[PDB]
Amino acid sequence: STGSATTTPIDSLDDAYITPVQIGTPAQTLNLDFDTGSSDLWVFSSETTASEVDGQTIYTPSKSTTAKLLSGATWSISYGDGSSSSGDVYTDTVSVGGLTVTGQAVESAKKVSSSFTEDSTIDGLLGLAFSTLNTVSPTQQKTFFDNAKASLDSPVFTADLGYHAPGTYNFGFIDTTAYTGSITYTAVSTKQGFWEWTSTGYAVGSGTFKSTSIDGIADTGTTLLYLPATVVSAYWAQVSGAKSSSSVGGYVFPCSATLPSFTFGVGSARIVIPGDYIDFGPISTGSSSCFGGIQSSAGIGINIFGDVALKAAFVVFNGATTPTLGFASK
Numbered sequence: 001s002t003g004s005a006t007t008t009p010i011d012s013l014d015d016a017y018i019t020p021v022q023i024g025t026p027a028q029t030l031n032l033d034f035d036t037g038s039s040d041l042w043v044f045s046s047e048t049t050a051s052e053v054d055g056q057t058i059y060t061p062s063k064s065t066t067a068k069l070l071s072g073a074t075w076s077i078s079y080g081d082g083s084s085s086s087g088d089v090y091t092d093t094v095s096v097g098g099l100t101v102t103g104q105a106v107e108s109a110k111k112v113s114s115s116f117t118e119d120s121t122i123d124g125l126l127g128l129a130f131s132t133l134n135t136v137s138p139t140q141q142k143t144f145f146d147n148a149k150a151s152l153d154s155p156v157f158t159a160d161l162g163y164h165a166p167g168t169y170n171f172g173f174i175d176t177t178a179y180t181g182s183i184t185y186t187a188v189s190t191k192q193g194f195w196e197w198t199s200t201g202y203a204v205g206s207g208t209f210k211s212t213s214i215d216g217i218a219d220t221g222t223t224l225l226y227l228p229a230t231v232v233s234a235y236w237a238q239v240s241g242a243k244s245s246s247s248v249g250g251y252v253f254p255c256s257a258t259l260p261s262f263t264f265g266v267g268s269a270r271i272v273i274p275g276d277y278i279d280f281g282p283i284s285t286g287s288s289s290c291f292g293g294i295q296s297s298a299g300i301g302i303n304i305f306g307d308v309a310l311k312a313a314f315v316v317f318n319g320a321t322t323p324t325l326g327f328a329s330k
Contacts, residue, residue: 001099001100001148001151001152001153001172002098002099002152002153002170002171002172002173003095003096003097003098003099003148003169003170003171003172004097004098004168004169004170004171004175005019005020005021005096005097005168005169006019006020006166006167006168007019007034007161007162007166007167007168007169008166009162009164009165009166010119010121010122011121012164012281013223013280013281014161014162014163014164014223014307014311015223016033016119016121016122016221016223016307017033017034017161017167017220017307018031018032018033018121018122018123019031019032019033019034019096019097019126019169020032021094021095021096021126022093022094022095022096023043023059023064023092023093023094023106024059024061024063024064024065024066024067024092024093025064025065025066025092025093026064027095028057028059028060028063028064029057030043030044030057030058030059030123030124031057031121031122031123032122032123032124032125032126033122033124033125033126033221034125034126034128034159034169034220034221035125035126035127035128035129035219035220035221036128036129036159036194036195036217036218036219036220036221036317037080037129037194037195037217037219037220037221037222037304038077038079038125038127038129038133038221039127039128039129039130039131039132039133039134039135039143039193040075040077040107040125040127040133040134040135040136041094041104041105041106041107041124041125041126041127041143041144042075042077042085042087042106042107042108042109042124042125043058043059043106043107043108043109043123043124044056044057044058044059044109044112044116044123044124045058045059045060045061045087045108045109046058046059046060046061046062046108047087047088047108047109047110048087048108048109048110048111048112049110049111049112052109052111052112052116052117053117054117054118054120055120056120056122056123057123058123059106059108059123059124061090061092061106061108064090064092066092066093066102067090067091067092067106068090068091068092069088069089069090070088070089070090070091070105070136070139070141072138073088073089073105073136073137073138073139073141074086074087074088074089074136074137075087075088075089075107075135075136075137076135077135079221080222080300080304081115082113082115083113083115083116084111084112084113085109085111085112085113085116086109086110086111087107087108087109087110087111088107088108088110089105089106089107089108089136089141090105090106090108091103091104091105091106092104092106094106094144096126096144096169096171097169097170097171099148099151099152099171099172101144101147101148103147104144104147105134105136105141105142107135107136107141109124125221126144127143127144128143128144128145128157128220128317129143129193129194129195130143130146130190130193130194131143131146132190132193133193133194145157145171145317145319146319148171148172149319151172152171152172153172153173154172154173154174155172155318155319155320156171156172156173156174156316156317156318156319156320157169157170157171157172157317157319158170158174158175158178158314158315158316158317159220159310159314159315159317160175160178160179160314160315160330161220161307161310161311162311163274163276163277163311163312167311174316174326178314178330179313179314179328179329179330180328180329180330181328181329182269182328183314183316183326183327183328184266184267184268184269184326184327184328185267185316185318185324185325185326186198186266186267186324186325186326186327187324188318188323188324188325190323192217192302194217194218194219194302195217195218195219195317195323195325196215196216196217196302197215197216197217197218197325198213198214198215198216199213199214199215199216199264199265199266199305200212200213200265200266200267200268201213201214201264201265202214202227202231202262202263202264202265203262203263203270204234204235204238204260204261204262204263205238205260205261205262205275206260207238209263209265209270210234211265214227214228214231214264214303215302215303216297216302216303216304216305217302217303217304217305218305218310218315218317218325219304219305219306219310220306220307220310221306222304222306222307223280223293223306223307223308224280224293224294224295224304224306224307224308225262225273225278225293225294225295225304225305225306225308225309226295226296226297226300226302226303226304226306227294227295227296227297227303228296228297228298228303229296229297229298232251232294232295232296235260235262235294236251236253236292236294238260239253239254239257239259239260240254240257241253241254241257242254242257242292244296245289248283248289248291250291250292250295250296251291251292251294251295251296252283252289252290252291252292253289253290253292254288254289254290255281255282255287255288255289255290256288257290258275259275259276259278259279260275261273261274261275262275262278262294264305264309266325266327269327271309271312271313271327271329272312272329273308273309273312274312277293277308277311277312278292278293278294278308279292279293280292280293293308294308312329313327313328313329313330314327314328314329314330315327316328
């Protein structure tokens with residue numbers, strides 16, 4: 001089997017992407033944030049504290065003839081941005097882009113933090129990291145990918161995120177029309193439960209490539225590119241008037257600037273992030289200070305190849321017995 005679903009930016013900045021997901025019988029379609037940096041499929045629901053729901057579509061398990069309480073199971077998750085959610089667990093039928101999993105754990109939110117309430121466009125998360133990170137207790141549950149994998153034509157999924165445009169998540173096949181040149185594959189460590197890999201270096205604009213190992217994670221659920229402070233400083237040094245602002249929470253730059261590209265290495269291959277991908281617009285409405293899309297990972301404890309980086313590539317998440325990542329230009 002295969003699946004193919006369009007993923008759509010939630011706003012004009014590509015802060016996140018939402019993908020429609022069919023849950024239950026009859027189908028309830030929710031728009032979920034596919035997150036290769038976590039491993040819980042959780043939804044706004046009929047159980048979510050009413051004051052914490054503001055415009056989201058909810059899953060109502062009592063209206064699904066295939067929903068079953070997973071008795072005694074609870075979940076609770078904290079993300080890198082300090083957001084959180086928790087609740088109980090149903091099993092139900094879940095379909096993505098025509099690919100159906102029966103008996104998928106659908107984690108129903110009783111509680112969500114303010115950042116989830118305030119975002120009406122995201123109805124929950126669909127985790128695509130390794131199932132070792134799943135938070136369900138006392139019986140850990142599998143991700144949608146892990147449950148689908150045996151049925152897929154190939155044990156893979158791909159992320160093809162758009163810049164200020166829709167893109168695609170495919171399951172079980174690699175669309176050879178969706179990228180240019182060849183796919184470069186690189187090793188993955190699953191030790192921390194992530195799609196963790198080592199970039200071979202970087203370049204800023206038309207500058208020479210710096211060969212250096214940068215361990216980080218391929219994370220579709222993180223907006224920005226978080227890299228070591230040395231690398232980030234070298235990038236923003238090429239932008240007149242850019243500076244790190246402790247008040248704002250990172251590097252800002254004059255909205256009048258033209259940003260240089262940023263290149264990262266994948267083995268001997270190179271992915272180029274155009275300068276426009278690094279602009280996240282005014283820090284507050286009407287400001288001439290703009291927020292940068294490359295920020296320091298110092299104090300996060302891991303480098304993160306978030307959407308800024310991944311949207312510049314066609315990305316293969318190879319879930320074979322020895323997982324690997326692939327990157328192609330597009």
